[PDB]
Amino acid sequence: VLSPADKTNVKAAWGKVGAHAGEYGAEALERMFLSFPTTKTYFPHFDLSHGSAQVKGHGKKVADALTNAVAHVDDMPNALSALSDLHAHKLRVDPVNFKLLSHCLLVTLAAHLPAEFTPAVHASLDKFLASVSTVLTSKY
């Protein structure tokens, strides 16, 4: 349940992120792995060291998922249906981990966009990421 103003805020912030989205996604994943080691149990075949190509590719995938979620903010539940089924039915991810990844994404956005990260933009991005976590967690 996002407001038009917060939707505009999220769209502007992600547009300002722009082409650095894959690097931001990889940095967010690295932060999540470093600060919440229990999340690494979902990637047993991954190389989770710093500057890892596997983590870089996964962060790029997550970043493009977030980009198309922003581009389809009005229709997230069916824009992310395949992802929601993989996350809930196959991977069986705890929603606490979704909260952790959203927090790490917010930290990365704060560290890389100081001017853009106003309190209003912070709240808009927080609730946008909460909505994204809601769609991925829901199971059908």
Binding site: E27, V107, A123
Partner: protein, 143 residues
């Protein structure tokens, strides 16, 4: 909270450059803005409708200064954290009736504020160390 010597040195070095008045008010105001149900405890602070009014509130700034002073006091006693925050834990649990989830929300907001203020200097290892300190402060208060 148990920290490695490198983590403790990094945490102390980064906290030595924190501006106490600005960082605390920023964290408190951002908590009030992002999580609007927290304004129930600060309804006596005056106007908290607009985010621009929340961040421009002298009472919010002063209370954030006090909160960050408590955070620094806990930082100086990372081995005695439950003992340092016993009085604050009693105050928050008996008279204020604050749910422990709000302490972790405030800690995460403070981590975001630190990242916003320090930019590239807020490396993922520093973030992990500060996450552990924030979790310990929240656990100490939740008792």
């Amino acid at each position: 909270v148990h920290l490695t010597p490198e983590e403790k040195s990094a945490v102390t070095a980064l906290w030595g450059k924190v501006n106490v008045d600005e960082v605390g008010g920023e964290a408190l105001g951002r908590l009030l803005v992002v999580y609007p149900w927290t304004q129930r405890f600060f309804e006596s602070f005056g106007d908290l409708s607009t985010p621009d009014a929340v961040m421009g509130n002298p009472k919010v700034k002063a209370h954030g200064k006090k909160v960050l002073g408590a955070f620094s006091d806990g930082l100086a006693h990372l081995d005695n954290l439950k003992g340092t925050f016993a009085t604050l834990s009693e105050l928050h649990c008996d008279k204020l009736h604050v749910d422990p989830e709000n302490f972790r929300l405030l800690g995460n907001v403070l981590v975001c504020v630190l990242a916003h203020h320090f930019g590239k200097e807020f490396t993922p290892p520093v973030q992990a160390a500060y996450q552990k300190v924030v979790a310990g402060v929240a656990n100490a208060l939740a008792h």
